[PDB]
Design a protein around this ligand. Structure first.
Ligand SMILES: *C/C=C(C)/C=C/C=C1/N(C)c2ccccc2C1(C)C
Length: 137
């Protein structure tokens, strides 16, 4: 299920509420939802080994994981945590995260390559769920 490729975000719901739930400074919340801050996603997939890059205006995040192999990473609000990714179907994977230090909401995310060629991502902080929808390029 080649998640590989370069991804262009074309929709995003409930994102500010997610940040709000996580505790994100209001000023950062407002800049976070600007048409300028739209993230670009590059995924590089081979087997159970994944490389995903997320790039905004002045920041980038790189993660490297194997499905099943626990790894270190950051939440959405950038808190250090341990993560573990598993398959849900052929075209879906889900990742649960465990805060390294401190304690806050229960976070996670999922990734879903559809049949109409889209890539759906969800992110969850406790009750609240954010969906974002990507296309290739
Ligand atoms: C949908 C995902 C979004 C809008 C990602 C936002 C992420 C960031 N990051 C990581 C960042 C770092 C510095 C300054 C601004 C940001 C922004 C809020 C765009």
């Amino acid at each position: 299920p080649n998640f590989s490729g370069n991804w262009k975000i074309i929709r995003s719901e409930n994102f500010e509420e997610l940040l709000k739930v996580l505790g994100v400074n209001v000023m950062l919340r407002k800049i976070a939802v600007a048409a300028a801050s739209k993230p670009a996603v590059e995924i590089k997939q081979e087997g159970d080994t994944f490389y995903i890059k997320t790039s905004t205006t002045v920041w980038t995040t790189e993660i490297n994981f194997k499905v099943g192999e626990e790894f270190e990473e950051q939440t959405v609000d950038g808190r250090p945590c341990k993560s573990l990714v598993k398959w849900e179907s052929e075209n879906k994977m889900v990742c649960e995260q465990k805060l390294l230090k401190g304690e806050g909401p229960k976070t996670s995310w999922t990734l879903e390559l559809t049949n109409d060629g889209e890539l759906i991502e969800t992110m969850t902080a406790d009750d609240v769920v954010c969906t974002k929808v990507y296309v290739r390029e």
